[PDB]
Amino acid sequence: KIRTLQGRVVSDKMEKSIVVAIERFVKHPIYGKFIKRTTKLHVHDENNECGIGDVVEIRECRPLSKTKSWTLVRVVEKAV
Amino acid sequence: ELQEKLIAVNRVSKTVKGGRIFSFTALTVVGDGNGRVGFGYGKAREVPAAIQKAMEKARRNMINVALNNGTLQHPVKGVHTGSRVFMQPASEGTGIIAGGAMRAVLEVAGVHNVLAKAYGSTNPINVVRATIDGLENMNSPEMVAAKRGKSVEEILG
């Protein structure tokens, strides 16, 4: 299979572009506690499809601006 | 099977109407070399009178200790007052690596090879009570098998 990192949408005010905050629950090297850490990206999309506050699948792809080197595969569980 | 030795001897004052009157405080330990240990404090006006007084307390105050061949069963803390203390079973090789005072109470007991470190304060009186707190609390599989109403092989194996 191909890559598909899950992540929740933060904003869409960019036109054919989005900002996604991927969540990851990795532990601290020293102390052992599992911390709720963020991986903030930008992603491409043909037209402003996704809105705000919803889970999204994302693929590693060709660079298509400065930053923003990720493509939207599809939406899963759309906004309320 | 006597085996007895001195740990420390400390000089202490009283202070009276006249001047001050010094007395010495010995600290001896005894043990057969087979899981019977006793410490005795003792205190007198003279140094040789103090250790002979100290040796009489230790002989009567023995404590039974179970042990595997010539070492501990399991790792054990043994806090007392300031000295927290710690000791670990270790292998058939090696020797008794521990601090002064803490090693005396070990070597005379019967143990031939353990790890040990004296955390917190390392006062000669308390570290001896610390080790013997730990060694008295320590237990063998033959005790625990009977305690849990089961079997020696099933628990261990």
Binding site: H28, I30, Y31, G32, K33, I35 | -
Partner: protein
Amino acid sequence: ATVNQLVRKPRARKVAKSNVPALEACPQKRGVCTRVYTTTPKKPNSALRKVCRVRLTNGFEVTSYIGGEGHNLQEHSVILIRGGRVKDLPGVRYHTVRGALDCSGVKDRKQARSKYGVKRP
């Protein structure tokens, strides 16, 4: 203590400072020297202790205790300085090395002559 408290603010290691600003992990250091003089020490000692206001090569100005019985220093004279507090004179935190450069050895010292820079008979 408290593990989450340490994630938010890690353990600040106690940075123990070096006693001697001769600096750059240097063993010794030169000094052109000024004011060779004498000072009375702390309470329980009482004496006249020899000392010179050394002017180090790296810019600092220090006081160095001159060991041994009798010395060559006077006003100037270029001297090598090692580390080592005296624990007697308040503030004198260096020792003038004997033998090295202009501070010559003490006369007639048979015992202990690596210290004090003296040769065999």
